Design a protein around this ligand. Structure first.
Ligand SMILES: Nc1ncnc2c([C@@H]3O[C@H](CO)[C@@H](O)[C@H]3O)n[nH]c12
Ligand SMILES: Nc1ncnc2c([C@@H]3O[C@H](CO)[C@@H](O)[C@H]3O)n[nH]c12
Lengths: 237, 237, 237, 237, 224, 237
């Protein structure tokens, strides 16, 4: 019922988990949710709704990049009643002892995109998550015995940057992970009056050049998913 | 293979057609290509390689927005030997005499993205197509009896833009179509030394709810595909 | 000693409360700290150290504006072993449900200053607080039965802004309070590897025109101080 | 008459060739036009009108820099019925394979000027030539046995630039020639609704300070002028 | 009163000298003025009013940085009738032939602040002093046997630069001194229709009393 | 010789007056100078050297706009030993009380050009004149009974600007005259270590004011040139 999602009101839960990869969304639906059904397939951007421990939950890909996820998050918020979005992504690390498969939680997200400047009269908008969602995720990770670090992400427009020196700048200012969406989702959440959080799994070290495979990212980053799902239940109270 | 493409050198032709929707890529392979073989499916971004009138051709989705297509086009160029990219997409018009189903060829692409400023030391980089490819597309269009306009596209970062007034400015400056990728693909081609072209069909008239029927759009879609494919043959001389 | 603080290592606690007004720092030291002693008076920027429920704590003015507070925060971190800074300030509100004397906690801070762009290669640095410090303040306020909202502040360079329309944009994007330092302190904390939090008391409403007096700001905003001090004790565990 | 041109409607053809140097315009009139008459001498900016193979054609200097040529091109468009402007100039190369005496056709023009950002709400306007004019020029060149390169020029505000590093950037993104006017003329054409093209001959290699001799310059200049003139005849059909 | 100044119209003279440090304002008031009276102490930003050779004169700290002094100068101009602001500060020099202990007069002020771009539609506003005040300061200095250098200051937002990349640039383009306020004060003066001047002593690469004498005598020259 | 000046060291005085129009330079030479001889005619940009009251003085056009005058002033300073440049031009007024034929002295020059930001690492360079030259001009004018206004000029890149509202901003900030060169000349002067000044006569009121524009002054164009020349004589003493 929207230009990029062929579904109707009620087809989505009020909370949506969103990886960039629709195939990871499919994996999550098949692995963590009961009674999951596909609710969207437009442009292959798979979305599903099922239950987790009785709680109605949706998962849907948002694609790669700020412009892509801004489209889906906006539509979910304005036309499907979605109140909370939890991005469950991958990222590259720049810090020396942040390692592969570490879970990072983006309370804020830096960016080299122009979208928030366009929204905010060319000033600095601090793209932040909802505090209660951050807190829920931290508490859930603790209950699960999973380490999770909270801090700044950096949302890049260019996965292949011509400016390698910027990575030293990110490292100097404590950036936990380089991904491509958080700052955009946070801008949309503030623009349209909803709540968002980005949780990422470290899938590459930008310095050491260690990296996981495409298959590993699609189907094995499960700590962040358990954290996300349990954090919703805490939020419900 | 690359982190976003599960294939090896040789799997892709040296020319790749790219719609945003990976389902359109599959449709293109099935409809216009002989002996089509799927060569990528990471993140559901379907890619295929086949032949058109004997000529080896590939077709693969690029996803929505500059950051998404920048990843795929970079990787195709540096790791798969691709020499030419032709985006085949949709766009919205802002000019009165540009009608639904019109074909537009982006000789240049304006943008509100920051990617080319990051590349170009914060100055104005004119994101342009390769001239020969533009000319090949014009001649292929003529031989098919299809009228096409050549000029500027505008590649937006925000499909849902909070700056409605900018559309008046685009109209004032002769922008032929509003889409979300061309300026980024043109930046990648310049950065990595390849050739690119974006052709679009007008599928919407901004500030108006006018829409074409399903059969009309497929017919028009097919016309664009034919122009792109025939243009490659002309380029081969 | 440093160019703006005539004290030696050890004279400051490892946690410093910092209002913009040195006379407020004096009030706080005399009212909340036991055995308080003056440790700075350079440029009349009073700083004191004493104990709160057995915990060594310092309080010192940072003056008005990002450039002023950036000086003091840097010096405390590099030369006095300060690990945490809690700014305890005043702000003006734009949101219709925010009232005079409400306490707001700045998980992030937007800004129209150029300093973070200077630090961050002209990109958007999300100026954020330390998460644990935010949670400690939230928990302390709950234990005290004091209400407090958590979200974005906006750190202005011009208290007398010629751009009145920017306040509508701040309001649309949920800015809780307009002040003049948080984004700068958060940038310094990030640069030098320390932790910071800004808590503000609403001293004016930009829409309803209500306003506390200079005398009230100097001495009567005590809820935010109780929250700050108790949050430190929580932080110590 | 207009503030910088003392002529009347009819004194100029609907196509004007424009070198920067008014003395070069005088040379073009004497050399290529029959029955040439001087139609402007305000500020010494000589313009002439005559015929080339029966076709009415004008030639006039535009002076140095974007601000200068923007004045002349605007006035020609709004007050003298001019439809097409062909800048005929020299440029410096930054690419090793681009050689002295090569003819470059600016299908696009990059710039470090702010004039187009001012016009285009501080976004990226792709300053482009008219496609048919570009094609006419290629075809004309081919007929004359010259292979012209088509791509981006860079229009500089500073002939004596303090930023030597920018040339490396220009080279990396494939800029064919450096001059000082094209992006400005293209901006004017778009703003006031006309068509423009810039053709340049490479008279210098910026990195080595290679410089063309006087005799070879006169030869390549003539080639460029023949190309421009014959392109007009092709456009007429 | 204003939110940052607890005084009333008439408490300030129509010219105010402003050092950054309020304790320096107190020193100035005590050393140079007759019948000096404290007229502001909000936030400890001490302001005083007295006479210098029969001429009513005020002196008040403005704090460090563009945002701080922009507040105080605006309120003085719009709410206390002040017509002229003279900043009397210290600066660091980058030029070889600008000496320690030299007096520099900022006819213009560069800055890495965004405040004037906010004011001037993101274009380049040349933050300048009032010409007559510059002339008066030069002439007052001359009469005191001092050659003041007139030129550009640079007003920094970051005393502690993250990379220090601007220093060589300031030197290349002839900046006389580095401080943290002038361009802000000049922007305020332009915005609200008053006149301002920044005078600095080169404190790095009295003297202080000489600078104050130049500022005070330059006012008396202006009154003529 | 230099790329834009066919002359040798010694041909120019160490002070050069520069109008935009080279024909105006000719007029000044013939009207004001003894034993004037032409020293340059490259690109029709006439320059002359003669004496005024025994004092060796040059006069030469600079063309229109920052890029044009930046070329000439740089070449004069670095290759012809020029120490002082005085632009003598016309400007438009935006202030209601500024009269036609009033003389404006640009102690500073605002601009919408990017050249100084290029020089100054994207920060605000205050483009200022030499103080002694300003003072000499004020005294020279006063001696002739002319009260010259001293303040900011605004140097525009676009004579035909799309942003009419900016003239309101100029008026609000007390801009005395609008022209097209001062900020660029002042930038060159600072870059290459020389001294410069722009003096202008008001030739028009920009835009229509509800108010009444005062009246017209009795001051002439010849009066301004006299001021300029006499200011040189004062500076010599
Ligand atoms: N009116 C419009 N505005 C922006 N983008 C598009 C498109 C294209 O469709 C996608 C978004 O729907 C994206 O790839 C964009 O380039 N079609 N019509 C459009
Ligand atoms: N070399 C220098 N750099 C920056 N600021 C200053 C100052 C002034 O001193 C204060 C900072 O110490 C502030 O008001 C600034 O304008 N003196 N010397 C300086």
């Amino acid at each position: 019922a929207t230009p990029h999602i062929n579904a109707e009101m009620g087809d989505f839960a009020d909370v949506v988990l969103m990886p960039g990869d629709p195939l990871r969304a499919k994996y999550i639906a098949e692995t963590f949710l009961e009674d999951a059904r596909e609710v969207n397939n437009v442009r292959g951007m798979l979305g599903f709704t099922g239950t987790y421990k009785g709680r109605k939950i949706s998962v849907m890909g948002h694609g790669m990049g700020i412009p892509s996820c801004s489209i889906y998050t906006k539509e979910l918020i304005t036309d499907f009643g979605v109140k909370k979005i939890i991005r469950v992504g991958s990222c590259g690390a720049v810090l020396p002892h942040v390692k592969l498969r570490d879970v990072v939680i983006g309370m804020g997200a830096c960016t080299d995109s122009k979208v928030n400047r366009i929204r905010f009269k060319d000033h600095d908008f601090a793209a932040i998550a909802d505090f209660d969602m951050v807190r829920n995720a931290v508490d859930a990770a603790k209950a699960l015995g999973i380490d999770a670090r909270v801090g700044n992400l950096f949302s890049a427009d260019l996965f292949y940057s011509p400016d390698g020196e910027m990575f030293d700048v990110m490292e100097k200012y404590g950036i936990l992970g380089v991904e491509m969406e958080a700052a955009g989702i946070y801008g949309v959440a503030a623009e349209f009056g909803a709540k968002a959080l980005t949780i990422c799994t470290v899938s590459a070290h930008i310095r050491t050049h260690e990296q996981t495979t495409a298959a590993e990212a699609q189907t094995t980053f499960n700590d962040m998913i358990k954290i996300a799902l349990e954090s919703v239940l805490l939020g419900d109270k």
